Design an enzyme around this catalytic site. Structure first.
Site, PDB file in Angstrom:
ATOM      1  N   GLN A  27      -1.268   2.738  -7.372  1.00 56.41           N
ATOM      2  CA  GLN A  27      -2.636   3.503  -7.196  1.00 56.41           C
ATOM      3  C   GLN A  27      -2.546   5.041  -7.570  1.00 56.41           C
ATOM      4  O   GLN A  27      -3.248   5.709  -8.312  1.00 56.41           O
ATOM      5  CB  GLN A  27      -3.120   3.371  -5.837  1.00 56.41           C
ATOM      6  CG  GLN A  27      -4.129   2.119  -5.562  1.00 56.41           C
ATOM      7  CD  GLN A  27      -5.470   2.021  -6.689  1.00 56.41           C
ATOM      8  OE1 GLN A  27      -6.456   2.752  -6.298  1.00 56.41           O
ATOM      9  NE2 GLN A  27      -5.531   1.053  -7.336  1.00 56.41           N
ATOM     10  N   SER A  52       9.954   6.079  -7.184  1.00 56.83           N
ATOM     11  CA  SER A  52       8.807   6.876  -7.330  1.00 56.83           C
ATOM     12  C   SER A  52       8.860   8.107  -8.166  1.00 56.83           C
ATOM     13  O   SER A  52       8.274   8.602  -8.926  1.00 56.83           O
ATOM     14  CB  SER A  52       7.791   7.037  -6.071  1.00 56.83           C
ATOM     15  OG  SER A  52       7.306   5.655  -5.571  1.00 56.83           O
ATOM     16  N   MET A  83       0.490   1.740   6.812  1.00 57.62           N
ATOM     17  CA  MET A  83       1.194   1.802   7.824  1.00 57.62           C
ATOM     18  C   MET A  83       2.283   2.849   7.982  1.00 57.62           C
ATOM     19  O   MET A  83       2.842   3.121   9.153  1.00 57.62           O
ATOM     20  CB  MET A  83       2.226   0.627   8.216  1.00 57.62           C
ATOM     21  CG  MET A  83       1.317  -0.795   8.504  1.00 57.62           C
ATOM     22  SD  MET A  83       0.501  -0.796  10.329  1.00 57.62           S
ATOM     23  CE  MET A  83      -1.076  -0.627   9.252  1.00 57.62           C
ATOM     24  N   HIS A 107      -8.723   3.914   1.476  1.00 60.87           N
ATOM     25  CA  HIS A 107      -9.213   2.907   2.224  1.00 60.87           C
ATOM     26  C   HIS A 107      -9.379   3.781   3.665  1.00 60.87           C
ATOM     27  O   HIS A 107      -8.758   4.521   3.895  1.00 60.87           O
ATOM     28  CB  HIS A 107      -7.590   2.246   2.602  1.00 60.87           C
ATOM     29  CG  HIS A 107      -7.469   0.996   1.373  1.00 60.87           C
ATOM     30  ND1 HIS A 107      -8.244  -0.108   1.482  1.00 60.87           N
ATOM     31  CD2 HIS A 107      -6.387   0.922   0.560  1.00 60.87           C
ATOM     32  CE1 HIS A 107      -7.771  -0.787   0.269  1.00 60.87           C
ATOM     33  NE2 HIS A 107      -6.683  -0.331  -0.060  1.00 60.87           N
ATOM     34  N   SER A 251     -18.643 -29.184 -16.401  1.00 59.93           N
ATOM     35  CA  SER A 251     -19.154 -30.277 -16.501  1.00 59.93           C
ATOM     36  C   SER A 251     -20.294 -30.824 -15.527  1.00 59.93           C
ATOM     37  O   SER A 251     -20.387 -30.197 -14.317  1.00 59.93           O
ATOM     38  CB  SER A 251     -18.379 -31.642 -16.701  1.00 59.93           C
ATOM     39  OG  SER A 251     -17.683 -31.782 -15.480  1.00 59.93           O
TER      40      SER A 251
END
Ligand code: MG
Ligand code: MG
Lengths: 329, 329
Positions: A27, A52, A83, A107, A251
């Site tokens: 992200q 990173s 966390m 978040h 189907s």
């Protein structure tokens, strides 16, 4: 509900602000790359000079320790695992906050569950894109973008929704469309979807179906194609055309079977247990239990990942993925 | 299992045979387009001069009435809806069959359940590709191909498996890989997957989770993103990297919740009920029940489709797919 698109939102409210992106995972990368391409001054702030940090160096950033990124920025974006946000916040963000700075989340978990408790004199807001980092980036890079949810938790300035929208525009979200929610709604719905449906539910459904076939003596490779691999066909059609669209594409044999047996297999007691799970999220019980598990070493996760890694389905799946890749041009 | 690739068959086994593709839906189209590219003589046979007929003409085929395609062909491929195959066979194929012709299926249903009872002097075999028609076509045309299953039901020539693989090679499947199964195994496992998992199971799972959130008072749009739309992200990950890869890509919070709560929601009684559905397939009860139902107009399907089409879930979804469409590159 109101949908905001490029036209409804100006970048002027963040154009002159320095942004710290904390984190450079999937992200953090995508947002840092999109913001910088949109003309926003971005510093990447990281706890360690590890993989990173290298990746960000490889993308033409010059990363800083978390605290140095924060001290040099106005808008602090937490794109770190849920966390570990608490510890980073307390030790490397909190003591550097000044009136009028912004704390920005992807978040709602940490704010909603009081793991991060911000001062009263900063704005606090969220942009939650509805796709993986790579897609967030790819679409932006091709002059489109991915939809997102936005929320404001604390609007001290009076401009927090405008700022959230601007961030969402700068990462390409308003090219698609953005809808407003709340930290509480996004947190509770995200926990619920992951648990009962998106991750927990469908994984157990597919795995049970696969096992049932293998236990009855059918070929494992046949059973995998039929109960796991084919799910993409179905869910691609729902994503593109809704259930109606999907049902028209399969189907009549499939429609009749799905309509009559589907509800016998996934019956009312399943729904009742989903209600119970939602109750457990809403009371705080789920979050308490998780924070406790994590604090003890997340041994549930370690054992479950080992079981998945060594399962029959995982072994079979690998083999069929070599076959699919072999014919993919 | 043995996987067959290009090295295992020469198109020589069928290169000289004339093929009738009966039907020109998404599968009939793909197969006809690939076969002709592989240098196989293809005739499209159709019962009416409607949309399929026009599309075939668009693709450069001069289509024929079914019986005319059959009389002029050696290999008859049934790429028609399962429930209409019996009447097309009795009326348009069976009168014109001769020793050494081939009857070729994409699904085992009609042969397995004795709805078509072939004469003793023809080969009967199956090729069942494991992707939508457009992909069958696209990969082939791009120099790859999609994997498939093959099976022989009646090997009058002693070469039925070679001919099945040759047809699979001609539609590109052996570029990826082909596994042999049986008509029974293909039939039973396809019915089972549709009923408990791919169609019935997952739709009830997603709808129930949507409904739970909406009933609790969350915004329907938020609920839709979280319980239906995001499924594609997870299933794509499983498709590309298996369950272990999907789990590595989601948050630890998601992992813990999926592993603990998912198993409470989707408990072992779900598996037990899947076993009962499989017993009902295996005994022929399902097939009896459906053939009966279809013969009464399939009123179950029509009412089920209406119920879906005017559901909250479906109304919500229409709006949001404009959003995504609005940003795709
Ligand atoms: Mg989500
Ligand atoms: Mg299938």
């Amino acid at each position: 509900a109101k949908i905001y698109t490029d036209k409804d939102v100006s970048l002027d409210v963040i154009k002159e602000k320095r942004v710290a992106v904390l984190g450079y995972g999937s992200q953090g990368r995508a947002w840092a790359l999109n913001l910088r391409d949109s003309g926003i001054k971005v510093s990447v702030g990281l706890e360690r000079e590890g993989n990173s940090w290298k990746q960000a160096e490889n993308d033409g950033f010059k990363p800083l320790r978390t605290e140095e990124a924060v001290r040099n920025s106005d808008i602090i974006i937490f794109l770190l695992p849920d966390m570990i946000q608490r510890t980073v916040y307390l030790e490397r963000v909190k003591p550097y906050l000044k009136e009028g700075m912004d704390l920005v989340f992807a978040h709602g978990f940490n704010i909603h569950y009081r793991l991060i408790e911000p001062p009263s004199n900063v704005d606090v807001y969220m942009i939650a894109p509805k796709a993986p980092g790579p897609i967030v980036r790819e679409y932006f890079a091709k002059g489109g973008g991915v939809p997102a949810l936005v929320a404001t938790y604390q609007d001290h300035s009076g401009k927090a929704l405008q700022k959230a929208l601007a961030v969402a525009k700068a990462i390409g979200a308003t090219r698609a469309g953005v809808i407003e929610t709340t930290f509480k709604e996004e947190t509770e719905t995200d926990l619920f979807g992951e648990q009962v449906d998106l991750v927990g539910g469908v994984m157990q459904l597919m795995r049970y179906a696969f096992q049932t076939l293998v236990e009855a003596g059918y070929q494992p490779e046949v059973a995998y194609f039929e109960t796991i691999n084919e799910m993409k066909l179905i869910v691609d059609l729902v994503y593109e055309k809704g259930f109606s669209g999907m049902l028209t594409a399969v189907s009549d044999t499939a429609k009749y079977g799905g309509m009559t047996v589907g509800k016998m297999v996934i019956d009312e007691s399943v729904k009742e247990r989903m209600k119970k799970a939602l109750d457990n999220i809403r009371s705080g019980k789920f979050a308490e239990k998780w924070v406790e598990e994590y604090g003890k070493g997340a041994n549930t996760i370690k054992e479950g990942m080992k079981e998945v890694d060594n399962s029959t389905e995982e072994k079979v799946g690998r083999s069929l993925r070599d076959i699919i890749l072999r014919g993919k041009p």
